[PDB]
Structure formats: C-alpha cells, structure tokens
C-alpha cells in the first residue's frame, strides 16, 4: 500500500520589466528635448516664411518701377 499522491504549488515568473526603467527615462528625456527643438524650429520657420513673403512685394515693386522707367526713357528718347 505504498501508493503515494501529490499536490502542486505554482510560482509566477517576474513580469516583463526591470529593464524598462533605465533606458526608458533617458528615452523620455531625449524625446522631450527633441520636442522642444521641433517647437523652436517651427517658430523660426514661420518667421522666415513671413520675411520671404515681405521680400516678395518689394521685389515686384522694383521690377515694375524699373520697367516703367526704361519704357518712358525709350519713348522720350526717340
């Protein structure tokens, strides 16, 4: 009558982490810095676009003025 039976106990392997808290924090800090740099680039790019738009009008005005002056001088000369 040496017929034995058993029961079982369970253990849980550690969840997936303990490497997600050293590279993670550095990743977040770098992401924040990149976000700030992107915001600054946004602002600078908008300012540059405004300045180019401003330049356009003066360019067109000088072109028109020179063309009209040349035509007038030619007309009077002949």
């Amino acid at each position: 009558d040496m017929r034995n039976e058993l029961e079982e106990m369970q253990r849980r392997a550690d969840q997936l982490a303990d490497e997600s808290l050293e590279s993670t924090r550095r990743m977040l800090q770098l992401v924040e810095e990149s976000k700030d740099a992107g915001i600054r680039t946004l602002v600078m790019l908008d300012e540059q676009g405004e300045q180019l738009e401003r330049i356009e009008e003066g360019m067109d005005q000088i072109n028109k003025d020179m063309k009209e002056a040349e035509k007038n001088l030619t007309d009077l000369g002949k």
């Binding site: 810095e33 740099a37 600054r40 600078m44």
Partner: protein, 140 residues
C-alpha cells in the same frame, strides 16, 4: 575672414570660422588658442534659445585639450565648467571624462580602455576625438 565677419556683427559665420581655426590649432598641438576659442564659443552659445543645447559639446572639446596639458588642470577646468553650467553635470561627456580621470589617476590602462570602448559602442568616434584619446592613453 572671422575678423571681417565679426566686424559686421555676423556671429554665426565668425563662430564657424573660429571653430575651424581652433580645430586646426589643436591638430597642430597649439592647445592655448584652441581652449580659448572653445571657451569663448561655448559661453556665447550658452545664452541662446536655439544653440544652448550644443553648449556642452564645445566645453568637452576644450576639456580634452586640458588633459593634454595636464591632469589636475583638466580636473579644475571640469569643476569650473560644471559650476558655470550645472546642466553639464548630467551629460555623457562629463561622466566619460570623470571615468577617464579616475582610471588615469592610478596608472590603470585597462579601465581606460573599457570605458573608451563602452562609450564608442554607443556612438562612433571621429578622427579628432580618437587621435586625442590615443595621445592621452599614450601619455600613461
């Protein structure tokens, strides 16, 4: 060219020209001019909303030059830079230079090599940095 540009308050081009001049002077073993230019450029860029993030790098370069002149000079320069720029105390360059100083203070070459390799693994070193590091290693 740098003097001409600075005469017209052209800071960016003058800074780039001074950077090239300091680099070439360092290549020729003229450490004083290189450190002076690097310190000036770093201080100038510290007070900008865009260039601020680069202010660390220049300092590191200057610090390397100090290591060529002497050890305690480099340590004092590091202390001065950290006091002037507290955020410099978290950058990888400061940690690398601290580790190199610790290894170099006890005639330890193995730890020097391990730290150099560990840092180079993350980012590839350029000819200037690797040559300066080889010189420092050859010193002792």
């Amino acid at each position: 060219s740098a003097d001409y540009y600075k005469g017209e308050e052209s800071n960016s081009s003058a800074n780039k020209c001074l950077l090239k001049v300091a680099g070439y002077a360092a290549q020729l073993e003229q450490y004083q001019k290189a450190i002076d230019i690097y310190e000036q450029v770093g201080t100038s860029a510290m007070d900008s909303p865009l260039l601020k993030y680069s202010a660390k790098d220049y300092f590191f370069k200057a610090a390397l030059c100090h290591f060529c002149i002497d050890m305690l000079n480099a340590k004092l320069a590091v202390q001065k830079y950290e006091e002037l720029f507290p955020a410099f105390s978290d950058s990888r360059e400061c940690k690398l230079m601290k580790k190199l100083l610790e290894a170099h203070e006890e005639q330890n070459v193995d730890s020097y090599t391990e730290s150099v390799k560990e840092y180079d693994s993350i980012s590839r070193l350029d000819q200037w940095l690797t040559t300066m590091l080889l010189r420092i290693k050859k010193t002792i």
